[PDB]
């Protein structure tokens, strides 16, 4: 397979526009990667992470996105909070794995790297795995927007302010979720 195209990959998608890839019919070695000790988080819910590589599956879904360290606890099976309710929601029955590593040196940028966007407003929560397609403006306050983002009517969240000199709670992390 091309896990290196996922792990040794160049660009990562922002959480509002996470990246899904289907994977099947290829050769993968799992304990080399989970034990590569290159990631800050590699937590598997459902399947045992410990060498439960005795399988070959019909399909593999890979969802990639960007968060901050402080925010990792909200990116988890059956987790509650801003991102899940308003930005990207995962169902409680997540039979998969989540990997994430600090990519400050790779996702920061001088003057700040403002490439990652997040959805900050939504009327509802995300019905298992959708992405930033429609990015309109919604009245999130009293009356019609009719145009220019303004009073009681906005977009989603801004950029992440991933300056390279940030604290870790404020640092960029790349996340890849395998189902």
């Amino acid at each position: 397979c091309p896990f290196g195209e996922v792990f040794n990959a160049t660009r990562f998608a922002s959480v509002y526009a996470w990246n899904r890839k289907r994977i099947s019919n290829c050769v993968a070695d799992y304990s080399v990667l989970y034990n590569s000790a290159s990631f800050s988080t590699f937590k598997c819910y459902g399947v045992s992470p410990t060498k439960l590589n005795d399988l070959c599956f019909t399909n593999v879904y890979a969802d990639s996105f960007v968060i901050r360290g402080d925010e990792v606890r909200q990116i988890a099976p059956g987790q509650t909070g801003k991102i899940a309710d308003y930005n990207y929601k995962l169902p409680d029955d997540f039979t998969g794995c989540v990997i994430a590593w600090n990519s400050n040196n790779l996702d920061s940028k001088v003057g700040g790297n403002y490439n990652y966007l997040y959805r900050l407003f939504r009327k509802s929560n995300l019905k298992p795995f959708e992405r930033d397609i429609s990015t309109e403006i919604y009245q999130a306050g009293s009356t019609p927007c009719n145009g220019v983002e303004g009073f009681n009517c906005y977009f989603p969240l801004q950029s992440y302010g991933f300056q390279p000199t940030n604290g870790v709670g404020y640092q960029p992390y790349r996340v890849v979720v395998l189902s």
């Epitope: 407003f121 999130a140 306050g141 009293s142 220019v148 983002e149 303004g150 009073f151 009681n152 801004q158």
Partner: antibody, heavy 132, light 111 residues
Framework: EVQLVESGPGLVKPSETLSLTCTVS??????????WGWIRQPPGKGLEWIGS???????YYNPSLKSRVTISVDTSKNQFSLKLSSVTAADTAVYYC????????????????????????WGQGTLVTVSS | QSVLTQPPSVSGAPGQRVTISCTGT?????????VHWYQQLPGTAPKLLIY???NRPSGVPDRFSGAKSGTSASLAITGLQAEDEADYYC???????????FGTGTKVTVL
């Protein structure tokens, strides 16, 4: 960490337009939802809201005073200017400019209350006297 | 009407509880947009003291509390301390004037 500074002439003739400056630092008036406002305070009296701008060029003036109030911004210098037309000795007062960080208190209703309650950083203030 | 209405002064001796009332209308204190309180040393820049009816910015003693009901609100400072010698104003947005309207304000002296 936010700084505002009002500058201007102490004596502005009645029935004219006064332009006062308010250089700031620590934030950009280009920041999403940020505001810059003007408020007046007559001798020993209460505060009076005058106006606010927006990095989107949206702006608000006291409805009763809209036609006589004018606010302008200069993102490049991070400054807010307050212009007052048809001034009168009645308009004599202490002028304050103030910074509004993004929208309202975003936490709590999701800022779903127009503007929470108010702003954050106040300037030192400038005393303006109107007389002919 | 255009001013929130407060009793023009409220006083007490050091250690007393001093409360300040604040009378508004349907459009501000009543059906309006929540009440904030400011603490401000006379002639000096005010400082937000209470936000969103009942939030405190960090630094305001827990002994300052706010309450609202109908078109009237009050702030209670329960155990006046030397730091409490200031002016105090209430404020709230009025939908009828579409303006943020201040209270008439109170100066404290620790007797």
């Amino acid at each position: 960490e936010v700084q505002l500074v009002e500058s201007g002439p102490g004596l502005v003739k009645p029935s004219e337009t006064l332009s006062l400056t308010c250089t700031v630092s620590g934030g950009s008036i280009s920041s999403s939802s940020y505001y810059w406002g003007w408020i007046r305070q007559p001798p020993g009296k209460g505060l009076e809201w005058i106006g606010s701008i927006y990095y989107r060029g949206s702006t608000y003036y006291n409805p009763s005073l809209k036609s006589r109030v004018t606010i302008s911004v200069d993102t490049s210098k991070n400054q807010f200017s307050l212009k007052l037309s048809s001034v009168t000795a009645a308009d004599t007062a202490v002028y304050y400019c103030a910074r509004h960080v993004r929208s309202a208190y975003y936490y709590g209703s999701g800022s779903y209350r127009d503007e929470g309650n108010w702003f954050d950083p106040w300037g030192q203030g400038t005393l303006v006297t109107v007389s002919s | 009407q255009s001013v929130l209405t407060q009793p023009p002064s409220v006083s007490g001796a050091p250690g007393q509880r001093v409360t300040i009332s604040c009378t508004g209308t349907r459009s501000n204190i009543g059906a309006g947009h929540d009440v904030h309180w400011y603490q401000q040393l006379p002639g000096t820049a005010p400082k937000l003291l209470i936000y969103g009816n009942n939030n405190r910015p960090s630094g305001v003693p827990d002994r300052f509390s706010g309450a609202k009901s109908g078109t009237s609100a009050s702030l209670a400072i329960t155990g006046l301390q030397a730091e409490d010698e200031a002016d105090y104003y209430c404020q709230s947005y009025d939908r009828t004037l579409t303006s943020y309207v201040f209270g008439t304000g109170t100066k404290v002296t620790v007797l």
